[PDB]
Design goal:
This is part of a larger assembly, with 3 copies of chain A (about 500 residues). The first copy, chain A, is of the alpha/beta class. Chain A contains 15 helices and 23 strands. In chain A, the strands form 5 sheets. An 8-stranded parallel sheet of chain A has the order 12-11-10-9-6-5-4-13. In chain A, helix 5 packs parallel to helix 9. Chain A is globular, with a radius of gyration of 24 Å. Chains A and B meet through strand 20, strand 21 and helix 15 of A and loops of B. It is classed as hydrolase. Keywords: beta-galactosidase, xanthomonas, hydrolase. Crystal structure of Xanthomonas campestris GH35 beta-galactosidase. Chains A, B, C: Beta-galactosidase. Organism of A, B, C: Xanthomonas campestris pv. campestris.
C-alpha cells in the first residue's frame, strides 16, 4: 500500500499512513531498552497502554560496530516485536547527537578525536559533542543513516511497520554555545550564507549584524541544521519515509544555550532559521516535560504554525499530563507521546500514569482515523481543562457547544463552577455533518446551543451512545431524560479499565 | 390466570396479581437503559437486589418511529428478559410527558410544532411541553398508547408478566404555570366545567373565584389530568391492566409550580381535582427523593387516603432509604421501589445501597403474599425508626407490642433508649390468628404484653425461628431462654447476605 | 468649598470632592444600625477599618412618621457621628424600594392600600411593592426625598459631610415581573414612549415588538426607572449632590426576574433602557456578593462603560474579597465598599475580614487623592491575582511592568509560578511622570522592563520606600541590592496592622 507520507494543505497538516490521515498515540521505551532481551516485556507494557505506535531507538553504537560493517540484530528485533503486537513504529536514530552529546557514536569514532574532532569550548577544552564543521563527521553519520534506511526499505518496504523516523535526538551542543576549534572559528568569521538571509527576509551581513547578541547561538543552530540536512537528505534518497527531529526546548525559564538546553537545536528563538536549512526534515516535535497549563499551552502555540504541525514527540509519563492529549489534538496535532513507560519501580504515581494514559489511548484508539481526517478537514475541536477557567465555548457555525468542568454528573451546575479537583477534564468534538457531532472525553459536561440568525429553536433529536468496532458504529443505547436533562456528562474510567463513552449527537430545529 | 386488578374494600386497597393480593418490591432502571444491548446486565442487577418487579420505560420515540408504524423490539426484549429472570414488569409509558417535558415524543412530532403545538409561557415563548389544549396532541398520545396496550394483550394476555402500567411519567408543565397559547387563553376565560366543581363541592364560577391565587395551577392540573384521562381510557378499552401515574411532588419547600415541580401534576394541593378528572387512572404513586423522617412520613401521610393507597413508585437508591419500606407497608402500602439501580459508578455509597435494599427485599420476598393479604385485611403493622423517638407501641386488641430501637442484642435496655447510630431500625408484625404473630425486621427489639380486662396473665408459648420455602414454613429452631429473656431481638445482615430472621410467635394466658 | 460633583471626561470618570477627584473607600453599617444608640460603637468600627466614607441608611419610616411632619433625629445623629470621627457620609435613602420591596415605607402608607396601591402579581394577589403606575406613590416618595435633601442643604451645605446620595436601595419588584393591576395593565398595552425607542435606536412599536421575550421586564424596568427619575429630579432641585442607585444584579446564574432579583432594577439586560429614563441619576453601583474571580471580573466589565464608572456599592465583608479593591481601581473605579461590618458575632472569619480590609484601606487611604487623579487621567493600573494565571504585564509606553504572584519574597522565581495559596495578591501602579512610578500592593512581585525602539538599555536609578503623611512623601529608606535583585517584593501585613510599603520608582536608560 502507499508509503507513509507527511502532507500539508491550506495550513493544516496530516500524517498519511496507508493512504489516509493517521493520529499517532505513542509510548516511548527508555533509552537503554532497545535490546533483544528487554524488548518483549517492554513492548508488552506498550500494548497495556493501548498505544498504536512505539517509539524506540536504533543506536549508532551497535548498528555500525566497525567501519562499513552493519549489524541489524536490534532493529530487526524491534520491528519483529512490534509486528507481533500489532504496533506501528517510530524509529529514533541515536546518531551524532543524543541530548546534545555524542555518547551514542560508535567506539571507533570515540577513539579517534583526530579524524573525528570534538567541539572546543570558550576555554579551548573539548566537549562531548562532535564538531559540526568537519566533513568527516557529517559524512560518517550520513553514511550510516543511509545504511539503516536502505535496510529499512528492504525488510519493511511493503509492510511499512516503521511509520516515521526521527533524525538524531534533541540535537545541538551541551558544553558550549559554538565550536571554537579552527574550522568553527573560520566559519564564524565568514558572513551568513545568502540563501539563509533571503529565507529570513534579511540583507546580507555577518552573524552579529543579522542576529545581534544571538550571533553565536544562531551560527551553531545553522551549523547543526545544515549537518542534519545532509544526513536527512541521504536517508531520503534511500527510502523517503517522513522525517522529524525532536527538541529539548527553550522553556521553563531556560535561558543559557549550551547549559540549560543544547545550543543550536530547533528552539523557538531560531526556529525559522533552523527550518530554512532543513528541507529534508518534514516536521519538528516538542519534548514537553511540565504539568503547568500555561506553559504547556504556550509551547504548543509556539510550534503549531502554518509550516509545522503540533506534535508532542515526548511528554512526562505522569497522570497530570493526560489531559493535554486533547489540547494537542485541539490545535491540529498529529500525535502525542509519553516517554519512559517500561520497567519503572512500582509506585502509586507509576500506576496512576498507566491508568490515566491507558484510558484515553483506549478511548481514542478506535477513533483515530476519524479524528485524524477531521483534524485535516478542520472539523475537530478539543480542549483540556484550565484551572482558573472551568468553561470553554466551541463554535460550529449555527451551533455552539458549552463545555463545563467540575459540574456534577447529574443535576444543576453550581452558580460558580469549581472545576475538577485534579483538573483532569477534557473533551473532543468532531463535526460529522451540518447537524451531527461525535463527542467524547473525561470529567466534563457539554451543552449544545443554537443561534443561526433564524427565528427557529434548537433541540436535541437523537443521542446515541456507542462504540466503533473496526470502523462500524455499534449503538449500545440512546440517551434521553436524566442522561440529557443537564447536558451530556462524561465521568471517570472505572477500575476495570473502561473509559467514558463515545456519543453521536444529531441536532435539529423547530 | 386472572387479569391483574386493583382492588378497594372498606377504605383498604390491594393489587390483585394471579387472584391474590401482591406486594410490589420493585427496582427501576435508569431512563436510558431500556435498550436490547443493555437490558441483560441491567436486569441481572435487579435480580441481585431480589426484587420481584422491574420498572422500565417504553419510549414513544422508538415505539412509533413513523405515524402509525409501531416497533416492538424494545418492549419485547424487556418482557423476554423479565420472564427469563423470574420478574414481573411495571411498564412506564414515556409519552407526552416525562418530568414535565416532551423529550420522549417522536421526532415527527418534534419537527412539527404547528400541527403539535407546544405550550407558551407568560412571555409568549415556547417551552418543552406539548399543549394540553389541542386535540392533535392528546389524540396522537392516545392512539399510540392504544397500540401498546393492544400489543401487550397479544403477547402477554395469558402470562401477565406486565403487572401495572404507568401512564406518562411525572406529568405537568415545566417552563410555565399554564398555557398562554390561543387555545389555553380561551379555555382559561371559560368557567370551571360543571362536573369538577360538583365533585369538589364548589359553586359554579370562574377559576379565580373557586381557586383564588391557585387559578392558573388548578387550571393546568385539570387540563393535564383530562388529557391523561383520554389516553388512559383508550388504553383501558384495549387491555384494562391497572394504571397509575407518578408524581414529582410539592414537597421539601418546593413552592413554584412550573420551576420547582411540574405545574399541573397530581400534587397534594390539587389532588382531589386531579382524581375527579381521571376515573381511568387507578392510583397515584409518590416519587420521594429524601431521607428525612418527617418529610418522608408527611408525604406518605398525604397520599395514603381512603381513595388512594400508599405506593412509592420511586425513592432514592441509597442505604438511608431502606427503613421506609416498612413505614410504607405499615400505612397500607402496596409497593416500594428504588430508582436508578443499574450501572452506577462503584462507590461505598452504591455498595451500601445495594446491600441495604437487597437485604430487606431478600427478607420480605418469600413473605410478600402473606404481607399483602394481611395488609388488605388490616392485620399488618410495621414501622421505621424515628430519630428522636426510638419507641413505638403496636396495638392488637388484647395484646400490645413494644418496639424499641438501640437496645443491645441481649440484656437490659438502658434507661434512655439511644436509637441506632444509623437509624436503620424497622420491624413488621402480621397478626396471623387471635394469638399468633409473624415478626421480622432489622435492628429492633419487640416485647409482647397482654392487658385484655381479664384477671389472666399473658405468657409466651412458642417462638419458631425459620423461613418460608415456596410458601412452606420451615422451622430452624425455637427461641427461649436468653433469646427470649429481653424481648425478641433482630440484628444485622451478615456479610454473606443473610438478613435477620423471620419469627412465628404464639402467645397464651393462665 | 465646592459642591461634591460627578464628572465625566474622555470616557473616564471621577467623583469630585472639595474640588478634586476622590476615591471612596467605604464601609456600610447593617440595615438596622442607623439608630442613635447604635451609631457611636458602630461608627467606631468603621474608623477601625480606616475607611474614609461610611454608608448608612435614612429610613422613610422614621423620617416621615406622619404626613408632612419630618423627624431629622437619626440623620442628624449619623452626620454628627461622622464629623466627630472624620468620616464622609454616603447617605442611603430607604424609600419606596429596599431590596425590591416597600418595608421601609411609612406606616400611614402601609395602612392605606386604597390610596397607595401595591403591585398585583400574575395571580391578582398583592405583593410587598408599591405600584409604579399610580401618582400617589411616586409623589409621596419624591416629596419626602425633597424634604430630606432640603434639610441636608440646610445643615451640611457648607461642610459637605454627605458626599453622595443613594436613591432607593436595590429597586425593582420582588414577587412579580410587572404590575397586573388596572393601571399597569393599561400602560403595558400602550406602545413604548417614542423617546425611549429613539434613545435605544429602535423603531416605534409595542413592548413585545421592541423587546421580545423581555417585554414585561423591560416595561417594569422603565416604570421603575422613571418613577425614580421623578424622585431624583425633585431632590436635584433642592440640593444637587451626586445621586446613584445600587443594583441587585442579574449574575451568578440568577435568571428569574421577580424572584432571583428585583424585576426592573438597573440590571445588565436593561441597562441602556434604565439610564435613558434617569438623567437625574449620575451613576450605577454594583452589589457584588461573590468571591469568584471570573464572576467578579465579569460584572465589573458589564458596568465599567463610557457612560458609567466602576463603583462597588456593596461587597461581602470577608477576607476573600479584599483583592478586588485593586481590580476595581484598575478598571477606573471610583469607590469600593464592604457591607455589614458592625456588631457581627466574633469568629475567625469576621476577624480575618476586619484585618484584610483595614489593611488595604490603611495602605490606600493616604494615597486616595493621588489615586483618584491618576485614575481620571488614565495613568493608573492595578490588578488582582487570578487563580489560573499568576502573571500580568502592565504597559506604560516605553516601559513595561511584569507582575508575579507566588514568587518568594527574595530569590529566583520558580520555573512555574504557583500563585499565592489564598490568592491574596494585588498590586497598583500610578505613573507619576515619564519615568517615575508609584507602586504598592500585597503579596506580589513587580519587575520593570524597557523596550522603546531605542538602542538604549533600561536601568533602575532610585527606589524610595516610605509613606504619605498628610500629602507628604516621607522616605524611610532607599531600596537597592538584595531588595532590588529580584524585582520589588511586597509581602504581608504584620500582626501590628502595618501593611506592605509604598514605593516610588524612578527609572532611566544608558
Amino acid at each position: 500500500e502507499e508509503l507513509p507520507r507527511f502532507f500539508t494543505q491550506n495550513g493544516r497538516h496530516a500524517l498519511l499512513v496507508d493512504g489516509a490521515p493517521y493520529t499517532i498515540l505513542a509510548a516511548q521505551l527508555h533509552n537503554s531498552s532497545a535490546w533483544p532481551a528487554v524488548l518483549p516485556p517492554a513492548l508488552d507494557q506498550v500494548v497495556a497502554l493501548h498505544a498504536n505506535t512505539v517509539e524506540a531507538p536504533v543506536y549508532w553504537e551497535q548498528f555500525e560496530p566497525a567501519p562499513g560493517r552493519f549489524d541489524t540484530t536490534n532493529v530487526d528485533a524491534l520491528i519483529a516485536g512490534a509486528r507481533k503486537r500489532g504496533l506501528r513504529v517510530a524509529l529514533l536514530w541515536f546518531g551524532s547527537w543524543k541530548n546534545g552529546q555524542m555518547h551514542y557514536v560508535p567506539e571507533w569514532i570515540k577513539r579517534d578525536e583526530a579524524t573525528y574532532p570534538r567541539m572546543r569550548d570558550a576555554n579551548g577544552e573539548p566537549v562531548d559533542v562532535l564538531s559540526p564543521h568537519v566533513a568527516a563527521n557529517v559524512q560518517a553519520d550520513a553514511r550510516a543513516f543511509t545504511a539503516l534506511m536502505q535496510h529499512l526499505r528492504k525488510i519493511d518496504g511493503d509492510r511499512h511497520t516503521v511509520i516515521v523516523v526521527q533524525v538524531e535526538n534533541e540535537p545541538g551542543a551541551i558544553g558550549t554555545v559554538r565550536d571554537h576549534g579552527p574550522a568553527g572559528e573560520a566559519a564564524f568569521a565568514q558572513p551568513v550564507p545568502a540563501a539563509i538571509a533571503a529565507a529570513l527576509g534579511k540583507p546580507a551581513g555577518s552573524w552579529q549584524q543579522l542576529f545581534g547578541a544571538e550571533a553565536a547561538e544562531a551560527f551553531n543552530a545553522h551549523a547543526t541544521a545544515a549537518y542534519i540536512e545532509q544526513v536527512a537528505a541521504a536517508g531520503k534518497r534511500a527510502y523517503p519515509l517522513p522525517l522529524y527531529v525532536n527538541t529539548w526546548l527553550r522553556y521553563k525559564g531556560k535561558r543559557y544555550p549550551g547549559m540549560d538546553y543544547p545550543s543550536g537545536g530547533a528552539t523557538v528563538n531560531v526556529f525559522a532559521l533552523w527550518r530554512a536549512a532543513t528541507p529534508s526534515i518534514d516536521f519538528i516535535g516538542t519534548d514537553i516535560y511540565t504539568s503547568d497549563y500555561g506553559e504547556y499551552t504556550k509551547v504548543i502555540g509556539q510550534y503549531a504554525r502554518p509550516d509545522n504541525p503540533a506534535w508532542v514527540s515526548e511528554t512526562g509519563f505522569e497522570a497530570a499530563t493526560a489531559p493535554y492529549l486533547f489540547h494537542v489534538l485541539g490545535q491540529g496535532g498529529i500525535g502525542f507521546s509519553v516517554f519512559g513507560i517500561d520497567g519503572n519501580p512500582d509506585s502509586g504515581a507509576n500506576r496512576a500514569a498507566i491508568a490515566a494514559h491507558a484510558a484515553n489511548f483506549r478511548q481514542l484508539a478506535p477513533l483515530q482515523r476519524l479524528i485524524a481526517q477531521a483534524n485535516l478537514d478542520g472539523r475537530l475541536q478539543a480542549v483540556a481543562e484550565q484551572p482558573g477557567a472551568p468553561q470553554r465555548t466551541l463554535r460550529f457555525g449555527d451551533w455552539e457547544a458549552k463545555v463545563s468542568f467540575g459540574a456534577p454528573l447529574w443535576g444543576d451546575a453550581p452558580a460558580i463552577l469549581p472545576g475538577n479537583d485534579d483538573h483532569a477534564g477534557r473533551l473532543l468534538v468532531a463535526q460529522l455533518g451540518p447537524e451531527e457531532f461525535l463527542v467524547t472525553g473525561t470529567a466534563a459536561r457539554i451543552e449544545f446551543f443554537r443561534s443561526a440568525a433564524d427565528t427557529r429553536h434548537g433541540q436535541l433529536l437523537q443521542v446515541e451512545q456507542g462504540r466503533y468496532v473496526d470502523g462500524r458504529w455499534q449503538m449500545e443505547r440512546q440517551l434521553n431524560g436524566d442522561q440529557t436533562d443537564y447536558g451530556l456528562n462524561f465521568g471517570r474510567t472505572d477500575a476495570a479499565g473502561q473509559p467514558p463513552p463515545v456519543l453521536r449527537v444529531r441536532v435539529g430545529s423547530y
